[PDB]
Amino acid sequence: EDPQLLVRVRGGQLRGIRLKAPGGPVSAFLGIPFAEPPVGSRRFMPPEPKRPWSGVLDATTFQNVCYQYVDTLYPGFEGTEMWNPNRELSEDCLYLNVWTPYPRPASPTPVLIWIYGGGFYSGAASLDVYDGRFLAQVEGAVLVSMNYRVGTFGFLALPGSREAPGNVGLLDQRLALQWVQENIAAFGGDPMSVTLFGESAGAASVGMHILSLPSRSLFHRAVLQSGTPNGPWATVSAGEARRRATLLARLVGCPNDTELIACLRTRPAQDLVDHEWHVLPQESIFRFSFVPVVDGDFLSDTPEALINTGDFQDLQVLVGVVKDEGSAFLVYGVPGFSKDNESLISRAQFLAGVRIGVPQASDLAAEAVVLHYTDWLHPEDPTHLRDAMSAVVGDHNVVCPVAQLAGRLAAQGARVYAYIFEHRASTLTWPLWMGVPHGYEIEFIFGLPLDPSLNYTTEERIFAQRLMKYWTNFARTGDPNDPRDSKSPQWPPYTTAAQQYVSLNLKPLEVRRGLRAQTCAFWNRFLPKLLS
Amino acid sequence: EGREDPQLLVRVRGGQLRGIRLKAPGGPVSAFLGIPFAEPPVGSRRFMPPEPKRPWSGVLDATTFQNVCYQYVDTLYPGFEGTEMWNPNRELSEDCLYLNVWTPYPRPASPTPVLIWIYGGGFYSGAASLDVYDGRFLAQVEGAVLVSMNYRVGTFGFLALPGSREAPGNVGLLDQRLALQWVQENIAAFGGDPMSVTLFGESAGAASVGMHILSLPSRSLFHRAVLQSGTPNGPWATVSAGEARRRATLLARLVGCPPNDTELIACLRTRPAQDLVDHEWHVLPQESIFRFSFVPVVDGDFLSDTPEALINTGDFQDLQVLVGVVKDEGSAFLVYGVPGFSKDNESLISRAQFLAGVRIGVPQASDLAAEAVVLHYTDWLHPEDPTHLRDAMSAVVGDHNVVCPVAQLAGRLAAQGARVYAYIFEHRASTLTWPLWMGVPHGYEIEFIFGLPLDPSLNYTTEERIFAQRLMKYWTNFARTGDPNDPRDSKSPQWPPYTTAAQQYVSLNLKPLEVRRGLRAQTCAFWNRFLPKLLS
Numbered sequence A: 001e002d003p004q005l006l007v008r009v010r011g012g013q014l015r016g017i018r019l020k021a022p023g024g025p026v027s028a029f030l031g032i033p034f035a036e037p038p039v040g041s042r043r044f045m046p047p048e049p050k051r052p053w054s055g056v057l058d059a060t061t062f063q064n065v066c067y068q069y070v071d072t073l074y075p076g077f078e079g080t081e082m083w084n085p086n087r088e089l090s091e092d093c094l095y096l097n098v099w100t101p102y103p104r105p106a107s108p109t110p111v112l113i114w115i116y117g118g119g120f121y122s123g124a125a126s127l128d129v130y131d132g133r134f135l136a137q138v139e140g141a142v143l144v145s146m147n148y149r150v151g152t153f154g155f156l157a158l159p160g161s162r163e164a165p166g167n168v169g170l171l172d173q174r175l176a177l178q179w180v181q182e183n184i185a186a187f188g189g190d191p192m193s194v195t196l197f198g199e200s201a202g203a204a205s206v207g208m209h210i211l212s213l214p215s216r217s218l219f220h221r222a223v224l225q226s227g228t229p230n231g232p233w234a235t236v237s238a239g240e241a242r243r244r245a246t247l248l249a250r251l252v253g254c255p256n257d258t259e260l261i262a263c264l265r266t267r268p269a270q271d272l273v274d275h276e277w278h279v280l281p282q283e284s285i286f287r288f289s290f291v292p293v294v295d296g297d298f299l300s301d302t303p304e305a306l307i308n309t310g311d312f313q314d315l316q317v318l319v320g321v322v323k324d325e326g327s328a329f330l331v332y333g334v335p336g337f338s339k340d341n342e343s344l345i346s347r348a349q350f351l352a353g354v355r356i357g358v359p360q361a362s363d364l365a366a367e368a369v370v371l372h373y374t375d376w377l378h379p380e381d382p383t384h385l386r387d388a389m390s391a392v393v394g395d396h397n398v399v400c401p402v403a404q405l406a407g408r409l410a411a412q413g414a415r416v417y418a419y420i421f422e423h424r425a426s427t428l429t430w431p432l433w434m435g436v437p438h439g440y441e442i443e444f445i446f447g448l449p450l451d452p453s454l455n456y457t458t459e460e461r462i463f464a465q466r467l468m469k470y471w472t473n474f475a476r477t478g479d480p481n482d483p484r485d486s487k488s489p490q491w492p493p494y495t496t497a498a499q500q501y502v503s504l505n506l507k508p509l510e511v512r513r514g515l516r517a518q519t520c521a522f523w524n525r526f527l528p529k530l531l532s
Numbered sequence B: 001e002g003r004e005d006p007q008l009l010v011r012v013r014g015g016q017l018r019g020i021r022l023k024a025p026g027g028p029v030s031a032f033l034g035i036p037f038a039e040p041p042v043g044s045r046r047f048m049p050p051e052p053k054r055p056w057s058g059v060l061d062a063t064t065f066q067n068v069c070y071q072y073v074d075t076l077y078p079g080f081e082g083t084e085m086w087n088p089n090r091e092l093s094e095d096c097l098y099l100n101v102w103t104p105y106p107r108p109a110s111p112t113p114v115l116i117w118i119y120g121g122g123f124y125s126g127a128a129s130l131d132v133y134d135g136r137f138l139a140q141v142e143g144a145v146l147v148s149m150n151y152r153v154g155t156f157g158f159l160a161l162p163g164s165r166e167a168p169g170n171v172g173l174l175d176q177r178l179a180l181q182w183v184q185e186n187i188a189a190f191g192g193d194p195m196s197v198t199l200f201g202e203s204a205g206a207a208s209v210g211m212h213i214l215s216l217p218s219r220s221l222f223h224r225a226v227l228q229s230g231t232p233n234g235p236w237a238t239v240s241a242g243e244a245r246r247r248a249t250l251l252a253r254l255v256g257c258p259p260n261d262t263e264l265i266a267c268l269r270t271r272p273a274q275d276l277v278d279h280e281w282h283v284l285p286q287e288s289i290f291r292f293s294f295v296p297v298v299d300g301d302f303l304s305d306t307p308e309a310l311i312n313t314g315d316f317q318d319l320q321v322l323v324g325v326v327k328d329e330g331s332a333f334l335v336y337g338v339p340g341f342s343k344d345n346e347s348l349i350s351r352a353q354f355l356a357g358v359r360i361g362v363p364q365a366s367d368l369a370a371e372a373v374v375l376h377y378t379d380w381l382h383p384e385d386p387t388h389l390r391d392a393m394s395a396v397v398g399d400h401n402v403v404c405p406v407a408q409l410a411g412r413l414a415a416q417g418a419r420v421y422a423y424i425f426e427h428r429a430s431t432l433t434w435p436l437w438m439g440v441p442h443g444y445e446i447e448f449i450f451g452l453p454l455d456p457s458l459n460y461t462t463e464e465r466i467f468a469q470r471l472m473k474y475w476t477n478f479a480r481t482g483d484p485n486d487p488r489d490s491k492s493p494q495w496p497p498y499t500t501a502a503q504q505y506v507s508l509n510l511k512p513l514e515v516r517r518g519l520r521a522q523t524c525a526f527w528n529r530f531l532p533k534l535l536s
């Protein structure tokens, strides 16, 4: 019974487990409950704080994964399976994990809180790519990660009702945040230095905590990797949320809000998941059935509106994208694309993929996208049209929303650092043409190349150390730059004037200017006026 | 006769002519200047199609340039060489339908290819007697026979009340066609080969050449064509029948000829020439640049349909065309009514002035389309750089009016059977008096193609002299063979045809030919495939 593995938190006593990291032991406290299981009548409701417990709670394993759709596009394939649930599925899933140095840090350490992505319909804090181990052991960080409800469970909303007000998955997150504020001190963590970081839907989540006043006193810094609270996919309106909730209710046999939610609550979880794909208004990619809703409660107005008008002066933010944001979404319903062939495409296939990539586009709007993305020297080259189809999806959903977010925060007094991640993992099982797809920087930031038995190159081990240093340096100080190192070159702040960002690849830092500036101007400034 | 130089006495279908022996740097040339090719289009003939010149008696004197067709004399910058070199250099008169011929001295023993020049000036100005259109250098150095004609401009050439018999429109083009007929019948008397005639022209001259290509009765009058910085398609070279009727009618009112066509045209015919010129600007529907009041009309006769339609559905197999542009097509146009611009300062403008310019530069464009133009042309790293905005304003005008129509033209012609050669001219004359910011402006290749640098007394650099020799060879090789390349020469880089596949075109500057690919491809896709659909 190792005294280092015994913590007293507000709700009782905990037993963690000593884990092996390449360079030494870490303490891990996995599966800590932070909310009353949101089950039975509590489905679709705000989470409630976990009641105190007797004795000593076993916090040595990851707990169940929140109920969610399981991907079967390529059964057995590592490139998809690595994102699938690695624990039993259950509605009883509100548990968080904490990693700390062993021994318990002596003095107050910066806390990193991870919020996973998965399009608000999937994900878990227990996947191997979110292993806190290395950041704990190498960088001396306390690193926290929580589960939050996804799909219908987290985000089904009949806006303005009592029983399903929406945004509960975000509320789950906020509860984990309050838990950290209330308990982390006991692990050696520093509640006055909390850095949120997350990817894709996790980044939009972070974005939303930035944009929601009650969340603001629970953290000090934010990192948005490949996702934003603004943009076409991260939110729906109250009208549109009601529509889908109402259509789902119908689809599962449920005939007045109270009546509807009651009948929805009687339904086995898998019934809800069986019918969640079917509520989307159009054939599309990079659109998800149940996402945060603009309720006037959690989100007091649209993110677009909120980012345009907020005051961001005492706020530091790190944002960025991967080289090929859209490639991986193409194999999920764009005719012509597959991981098993080189996916070279006709022009007609391109116009079609654009209607699906930009579901809200009119004929003229779609024709503009097409005309903008065509290479007029090689206007019918199958390689370009493929790379362009990808680019359309990446730019429209991630890169240009990121550019806009970074723009507004800088303008309004936030301190912003931007990046583009351009290294393709050697261990990667997706085809070359996909490049560096959505999600594949995470293993590097988390430092998985430090585990020698994962067969990463020596170059990649070093790169991972550099990235761990940027993220944790940023957590300590709000500046990713190493405060005791020279030469560098330095990573400069993103500003609206200079628009400086850096590339994270195997080479040392290179400073560039303008994040797809011409193209984003099309997406952020033109198209809105067009489809109007 | 008796004591005259026997090389200068030539008979044509209308009678005897006496020419003049002129000194070119390298030797003498023969010139027959001011040959009448039409009945003077005065009095009751104003606005009417031209009638063939009636035979004269005796030996007509053809030693000097004749009158320049009635036109607006530029007064933007009085005394400034930059504008005055384009201004008329003979008396203004409605009696102006004359042409000029330069041939080697002595006239060549065997039939020589003929080059026919058609001046520009926005269809409202110009004269074949300007110093930069001097055929003596091409005549002496390349052994060419060169012809240039006056044709009516402004109201006199292009005022139309479409459907009427008294003012049918396009009569300026018909002047040009009549001179082409003249060349067919008469050019052999000078040693020219009527079976080998190449039209060339710049700006409106180019657009006119294009219209001869698209107008069937003109097709049997020439074999090859060169379009410099202008096209029949595009926003300025033609007007609908409706628009030309509105413009003729409005002008009539302005000069006190109120609204039946016959009565109106009759009253217009009583007006003094200068009152028509004093009022021709006032009929433009918007504040604008690169728009001219009386231009070719789409009449269902000379033009059987819009040039856009005719180039889309034309068969151009048996046709060779050389086409091209200068580096800075739009720059010179900015000083003619874009607030913020001038030749006497660096013309550094603001973002406000740019948006205002775009409205003027693209006058037919809705708010949404103007926004589109501005968004496309903004440099988003420096959306407020004065220098960049100035150069973008220039490019907006350049691309919309010349570069993208040329591209469009080269594209459609090549896809439909034409051998098309394409260029971009990048040399700024060392002698230019327009400010450096204007780059190589609209019109400033002409003096090189005509070989003015060979005149030692014109203060051109030695490099420029060589450059002009080169260009003269390209143009005449093209007249001679339909290929600008020299047969005997050997890389010495080749000029490849422009195709839809490769989109090849050469740079013309002091360095040897460099092949480039894509005549401003992305941006022109904007003007040619996007903007149309936004103004639907």
Ligand SMILES: Nc1ccc2c(c1)c(-c1ccccc1)[n+](CCCCCCc1cn(CCNc3c4c(nc5ccccc35)CCCC4)nn1)c1cc(N)ccc21
Pocket: A069, A071, A073, A079, A080, A083, A117, A118, A119, A121, A123, A199, A200, A276, A277, A286, A288, A289, A328, A329, A331, A332, A333, A437, A438, A439, A440
């Ligand atoms: N027959 C069905 C029934 C239900 C659903 C269906 C299909 C599909 C679907 C599968 C294949 C082709 C078309 C459609 N889908 C899939 C549509 C969702 C497509 C997004 C997949 C994706 C792709 N990426 C980028 C690549 N890397 C990742 C992943 C995955 N997750 C993550 C999470 C975080 C970061 C990265 C990452 C998951 C899958 C693959 C790659 N993220 N997410 C479902 C979705 C629902 N919301 C509801 C029900 C179902």
Ligand SMILES: Nc1ccc2c(c1)c(-c1ccccc1)[n+](CCCCCCc1cn(CCNc3c4c(nc5ccccc35)CCCC4)nn1)c1cc(N)ccc21
Pocket: B072, B074, B076, B082, B083, B086, B120, B121, B122, B124, B126, B202, B203, B277, B280, B281, B292, B293, B332, B333, B335, B336, B337, B441, B442, B443, B444
């Ligand atoms: N206050 C008045 C009264 C009447 C007219 C007015 C203004 C103008 C005008 C002058 C200054 C600023 C704005 C408007 N204008 C001028 C309108 C602008 C059109 C001329 C500008 C221009 C500019 N370029 C390019 C530069 N190189 C050339 C030129 C010119 N000619 C040629 C001919 C062929 C090739 C090149 C070339 C003539 C002028 C300067 C440069 N070509 N043409 C008139 C025109 C009419 N048809 C009738 C009346 C008047």
